[PDB]
């Protein structure tokens, strides 16, 4: 396929596919039931490592989300299968980015030293089983 496509062609696709995309979402519910426990695995392995750190290092209520933004982006980079040779660069990239959004670096050096216990989350939960 190309790239360069007009504004009308994409709108024409999205408008005419409405019936098929909703009758495909109706089957994607059946598929989502068994695959949805990656949510449970994700928040288990993130809260089990961040609730003691945030809770005992002294950060407040509503800044915990900004720290979750940092940790969640790091876990996304992890479970797209990317090991330490890219992590040693994306750690200082994320450090500068969330310093730029108003955090304090006396928290950030300790937090970037802390996030090496977060790992990959998502697995597969549908086996083939031809029998």
């Amino acid at each position: 396929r190309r790239t360069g496509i007009t504004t009308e062609d994409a709108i024409t696709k999205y408008s005419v596919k409405a019936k098929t995309e909703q009758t495909a979402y109706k089957n994607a519910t059946k598929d989502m039931v068994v695959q949805a426990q990656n949510i449970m695995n994700f928040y288990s392995v993130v809260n089990q490592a961040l609730i003691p750190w945030l809770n005992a290092h002294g950060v407040g209520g509503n800044l915990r989300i900004l720290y979750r933004q940092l940790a969640n982006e790091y876990v996304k980079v992890l479970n797209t299968k990317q090991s330490g040779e890219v992590i040693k660069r994306l750690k200082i990239a994320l450090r500068h980015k969330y310093w730029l959004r108003g955090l304090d670096e006396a928290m950030l050096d300790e937090f970037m030293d802390y996030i090496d216990s977060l790992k990959s989350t998502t697995t597969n939960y549908i086996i083939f089983n031809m029998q």
């Binding site: 979402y25 426990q37 730029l100």
Partner: protein, 194 residues
Amino acid sequence: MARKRTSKNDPLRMYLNYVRKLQTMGDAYDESAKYRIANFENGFKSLHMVENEFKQYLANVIDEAIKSGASPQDLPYVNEIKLALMKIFTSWLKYSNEKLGANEIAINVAGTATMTLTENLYGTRVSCEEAVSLINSIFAVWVGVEPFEAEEREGACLVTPRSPLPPVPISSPTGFSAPIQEVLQAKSPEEIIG
């Protein structure tokens, strides 16, 4: 949507509420179609206009650099480096699409610039200073600001702003666009509305 009362950090409640509401999501989507289609109708035009404007102004800046006597092997910008620069400009579209102030747009686009120019210019012949000069040239073409100062101070490239950044000069309209056959075959204006 959320429960909006307390956090109550517990993953099993999360998965169980998801399993409970899967028997209603499949009908709420079918109901949501009727405004989904019109909001995409008048929301996709902003993306397609900002991507065409990036293509055009990048082509103009690169051709003005070639007319200064450089070689077309010096400045590739072929497939993925253009995709990097489209990442930073599409994030500029997002933070302008909200009603954010000028410097808040500037520092969010600077953060997206930090992440993008960290990731995909290691190992590909293009230093970060040339890329940031190119981004400043494109913003000089669009709104005439040149906001970003950069550094290769560590192993990654880091972008920080110098001046506030205006939002995108494109308005996303709240239209209800009707076909020309509906205009011509109708008998009254209220038949087009009603």
